[model samples]
Target: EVNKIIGSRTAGEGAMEYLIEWKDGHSPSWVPSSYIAADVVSEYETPWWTAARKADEQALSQLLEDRDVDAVDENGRTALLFVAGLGSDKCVRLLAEAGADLDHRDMRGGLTALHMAAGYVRPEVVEALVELGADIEVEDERGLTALELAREILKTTPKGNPMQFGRRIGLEKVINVLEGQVF
Candidate 1:
């Protein structure tokens, strides 16, 4: 729905400038002219601070060693939160290996990487987060856990369920890691 609005504006202008008006309407809010997709904003987020979230592994490892990877956006979304939503096991491992704060919450409804991993159906990503010490008990806006997401996937979409597929092929040894059973 929102894409329609953004599409129309950009159709003629060739670029876009996003301005977010605060509730009080006194402060200035502006999103620089760039090609940010609506899904990245709706499903992910829209923040000028999001630029820092896409750092490379080498820099991430250095930042993590320095204890600087947990830095938050203006809306409180940490680099960790965005990487999880990306559903890239590589990103998850990079952040976890670099020691990004597993428990950090984003301004988007107090959700952590575990919550984002559930939305993206990346079981490996979730497992990596849990293995790296992300709290499985943590809840999103709907008060659900990564375990609950897995259960739902297995029940509703059992055949094509990504997690179940991983379980079937023995690709993931940590399926029960958060549930307290070691492989």
Candidate 2:
């Protein structure tokens, strides 16, 4: 393992390197910046979150082999929380199936993955979350269950905007599903 950075050099943007001293004791070695700082996984939000956000099925599966799941991003939103609202259904199912705490709250908000899916009016996502046993009755810091909040979003959206038609339809389904009226 690297013990410390002794020095650094930038021969060119193409030839950046760092003098790395090993903990085992020996002469410091010139390590390429690519090796020292530009690791592929380093370019992402906790590697595990990155793959799930990008919906890279194969890449995510590889990480799953390590049984590493449920890491939050800089905002404390888990992979399941994000995918539930906007990502592919497969990704939502994948992360949830891995049993990453579906009820875990974000850093700032106490909203769970089920809340996000409901807020986004994603009917498919809402149903899938229920099937996977996400907490339907859990409340946010604002004290609203997924079903209750979905109702509020449906009423709050501008009724005249063309966008409302799509969301209205979707939210209707989600509300009903959460009410145990699945059809």
Candidate 3:
């Protein structure tokens, strides 16, 4: 019996099979989705947003086969912004090349992917966004540019701050990118 669909794969003909996990302490296996019960496979369907948020490159790319790169959630956050904050420079570039707006701002706080990348201390993502021509001077709702906010958070916060998971990640390198190198 099938327990869950943990993952999936595509073959030469673009046929797909889901990776099945079992609850009976049995080894897992790959099987066509139609071979599993709908109820079991239903929840395994990865939405583009979830794929983007989870940084699942394969799933994200697969789901985007017929979707828009600039698709937004209820909060109007772009896929590029999601992966940028998650620190996936690869996905950031992927989404951008797929036609995502490099400077698209989120409706929540008017934060761009660049802002999210800088605030989250994703230095590589910051550089990627900069290289992709994102507006470097866009201000967040707090009226601070990405580099300005990075400095503010670095000085005001401490290393390993729980409220700020990005405290010691890569603030220094991010600042370097914005400090007349890339920007």
Using TM-score, give the best candidate's number: 2
Runs in model 3 deviating more than 4 A are 1-46, 159-169
Task: Return the lDDT, model 1, position 98.
Answer: 58
Count of clashes, each model: 0, 0, 0
Per-residue lDDT value at 94 in model 2: 82
Q: Rate the local accuracy (lDDT) of all candidates.
A: 0.55, 0.72, 0.77
| Model 2: residues with Cα > 4 Å off, grouped in runs | 1-46
Highest lDDT: give the candidate number: 3
- In candidate 2, residue 33 scores what lDDT? 54
Worst 10 residues of 1 by lDDT: 1-10
Model 3 gets an lDDT of 0.77
Candidates ranked by lDDT, best first? 3, 2, 1
- Cα lDDT of model 3 by residue, 48-131, tens digit: 668898988888788766555675554768788889999998898888877778877877988899889988888889989988
Model 1 per-residue lDDT tens digits across residues 9-73: 11221233443434454453444434445554443323312433563555555434323345454
Instruction: Write down the lDDT that model 1 would get.
Output: 0.55
